[model samples]
Target: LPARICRDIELFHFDIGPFENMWPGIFVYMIHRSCGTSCFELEKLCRFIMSVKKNYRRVPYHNWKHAVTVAHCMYAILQNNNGLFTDLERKGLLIACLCHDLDHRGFSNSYLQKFDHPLAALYSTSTMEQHHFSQTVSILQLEGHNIFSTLSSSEYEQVLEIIRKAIIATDLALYFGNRKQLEEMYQTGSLNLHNQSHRDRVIGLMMTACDLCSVTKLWPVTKLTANDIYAEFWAEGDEMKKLGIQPIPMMDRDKRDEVPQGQLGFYNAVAIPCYTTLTQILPPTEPLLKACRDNLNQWEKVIRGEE
Candidate 1:
């Protein structure tokens, strides 16, 4: 990463930092710098990141690029809000972000269950997320890929649990419950940062906020991301049609013109609320909320045929 680019990466306006051909190197840089060199050997860390990137499919949305972007969001969060999370918690969250969508198969959990995919049977709820965790553990089992090899058995197990929760937290279905609970805690002024359970819920909310960080970016990046996301959903919709199922308007290729309305719905319903709640707890994320609000206005303009 360039010196200037690294400075910008610490902010919410990051756009992958111009290292398109060097993502694995980027991951190695981030992990080592944040988690430090003592946790894992440099060679093993590099190999582990390479393996993680290799596992992501060539899907339009949930590919390796998206994984790296999500991890960068976590990196930025940690950089902006120092001392908010412990070292082990920070490492777990970053690893989870990198592995959140491993082997995503370009379909939602609902789509997988509807298509009778085997993973749905393996985990009835959060099907893809469970698979992502299983895959992360599988990679760690590989030679030289166990980055947490330095920790004792108990500490390693705890880290694994953290990674699991952080990975599963990316599932939007779970976000509502987590958000409501966290908001209640904040409202009552009982959300202590040092409390273990409070931190757990906060990490869950942070995972979700980072996962959707693209929505808090500038308009150009947000537009590009929206196109990639809907492209993936439309591909799934095509698959749904082949199986004689009707796709939702957001997924239907024939209804592509409704993207503005769809985005408006998602921003109002999920993105804005997510960043707003997160900002309420972590004041350092104020820029994220501002960017999200700016994007919302942009979407509103699109819906009004003003842009």
Candidate 2:
């Protein structure tokens, strides 16, 4: 009922009546089936998701739209691979994706470092990304903000563990390790839904995959998302230039000639392969990935000063 949530409802054209009624009903159903009679726990979880909406605005890329997009994508993954996860694991994955980037600053990891922000200082260089994940968890643990307070201690612990793993896996710094693990799993070709270990790997990959899904969105949406990312980087770089501080690579626009396309190329080389492979496994994602490739091809042309 908060103002921001109301705004999101309006912006996204969400049926306020149905959403308000259905979400609480779903929570009740989940709690009854999974954790026995626990209305308090269910209430807390509902409030937590609602709070995420209340506290944040729908920015160009990392806003409510992205959250909802990831949630839907995660749902699709679950539906496609039904019987793969337990009720608890399924809930964990849904909540993790929903709250993963709560209150993202519309900036990339590099921008945070360039400013010597508190997150960067606390995390140090090596675990900066992990620090972001931990910070999000800490916020959720706040007394008034603790969303999982209603659950039993054990259930709460499990939720936190699953959420932390899924969130931390979003760090691109761990891309190589994640990719290798996923490749190994696919090679096995076991397709066991009851395998918790395999399920975790899929969730981790799914979280990162959703983060990169913007590349596969409609052209206008993709371009706008890209612009928002670059604008933030550019602003940080400009601030660094003014302060005589060294800007991060690719963020330094003055020394860099190609602007958006340079970044696009980097994304194409780094993120595309992972996404392409994922799409192949999923199949339905092929069209989306192809659209992303087409977008990149167009950007390549623009970067080359060709049309």
Candidate 3:
């Protein structure tokens, strides 16, 4: 509940100016639009976002900005005529999104593995994504940071379960496999639409969609984000090179000329199709996707013309 937090959140959203004294204002705005003005769920969401921001310093790419973005995307997806979710379901999804990446370290799963951090050790079978998810939940379990403090015992437990499942599912390793299953279900018309009642599944997919949503944004934004990711990867690679450690995939680009080619392959094979499918499922996201595609296309042109 501070002016700086509100400013940071607004800047994260690329909004024109600060809108409130706390990050909760954004959640309030979102809930007002989705669940109406009288809903108490907004207050819960605002508290959670504020709590996460208060403890975490960077609010890096995977922090509160990402949380709010995912929450908004989830709300949009549920409200679409797809109509798969209810008000309570949406509330759970938003809660899941807000809490999913509470204490992210701005590093990839591979980094966590390489470092042999306790979380990585504990979730060795699952990878860093699961470890991050578990860590976020653990932090919340601590007495002072328990953002779910206001809920009744049973409701709190339910919400905690939903948040846990949703956060764990954001791992990209889980994405391809889970998406394939969802696709098969969609094709067979046998997908358990009823299971959508579980807040976890709804939010899990929503978070996945949000992470991929960058591919659907306006080209300039997408290009900027992509460059930022590449820079981070390069920095990591440099660190590995210094330490005589094996660099993670795409981190150590052996040749400067190959960077563009690598990006092209990554975008075409992974980002584009993933986002296209997402927009198909959630039409309102089309513009965002188009922007992403346009951005990629522009980059492709620039790289090709760089001879």
Candidate 4:
């Protein structure tokens, strides 16, 4: 890890630092915490981390930084609850978080399909997510990277299933469906954390919660990541422009001034509903909803030219 790039890391309390410098150390820190100190060979796991990092293209948003932060969100959420999740759930959720964005090519699903990229051509649904999961398996295939080797075959398969389900559920389309079901359950006062079916739905919602959690973070943290996303989006638009493609309003740099309105829509349609639903199952995440409201207010202020 580059000590130079991660100087911003020291500004925070969490184990975060610049990905170029802190990836291995923090990667090990997270695994050791979730799986126990003796769960894996340190050097092998670090090697695998490096491989995973390399697979993430040099995209502005979907780079190693976003991947690690996504996992960090998972870590913080799981850590908030004591004895709620089984070891398998913890391990699977954390691992899936780390591997969720593998092989991202700096493009959205619609963009990829529009361009008829290889990954889009190969899968009819959740194309990039499927590639991400497939690439996660590929990394594990590398020698010395099978962190699950210590588990029995059945246990390993179970863990793999957990990871499979978790990573796939991250697709926003799936999240919309899962949220609808969970909302109905909660409204009917039938949502039960102890029920296996209900619990599985929560797990899926947890993935969605963590994925779009940027709006629910402390302002500085949220702004830093969001700005990078804004940059990534502009880059995508620029790419399309180069190809004589007309980018959508969200992607068009000229329309950047209207981004606040777009973000307002995002909070109402996605982030608010997401946090509100998750808090029903996990009250600890209620703070996240508060944060979303705060951020929403901030965006609203900015919209009114009052920021």
Best by lDDT: 1
Model 1 clashing residue pairs (backbone): none
Q: lDDT for each of the candidates? A: 0.88, 0.62, 0.60, 0.80
lDDT of 2 by residue, 1-307 (tens): 4465434422211222325344544433333443345434655666666666654455555665566556545655555555646666677777676666676766656666766677777776534446545655766876676756656899988977888788777777776676777776667876444677766776677777766666665566666677766666676678777767787756676755666557576566666776665664566545546666776776777776863
Residue-level lDDT tens digits of model 3 in 1-307: 4465344432212331234243467666656656557655444545555666664436225655656666655655555534555655555666666666666766677776776667776777556556555666766675565655666899877766666667777787776766666566556766565565433443555567766665555555666666656666776677677666978558875654566677678778666766665554556656545665676777688786942
RMSD of each: 1.3, 6.3, 4.8, 3.4
lDDT of 4 at 79: 65
Q: List model 4 lDDT by residue over 1-307, tens digit each.
A: 4455344332222436553676667767666776678877777777878888888888777878778877877776776776889988888888898899898877788778777788888987998898889999989888888878878999988888888888898888898899999999999998887888887889999999878877877777676777778887888898888778999888988999988898998899999999899887788767778888998998898888886
Report the C-alpha displacement of residue 299, candidate 4, in angstroms.
Answer: 0.9
Please report the TM-score between candidate 2 and the true structure. 0.71
- Model 1 has an lDDT value of 0.88
- How far does residue 291 in candidate 3 sit from its true spot (Å)? 3.2
Off by over 4 Å in 1: 17-19
Q: Of 1 and 4, which scores higher on TM-score?
A: 1
Best by TM-score: 1
Displacement of residue 306 (Cα, Å) in model 1 is 2.7
Model 4: runs farther than 4 Å from truth? 1-15, 240-245
Clashing residue pairs found in predicted model 3: 216-288, 216-289
Cα misplacement distance, residue 63 of candidate 3 (Å): 4.0
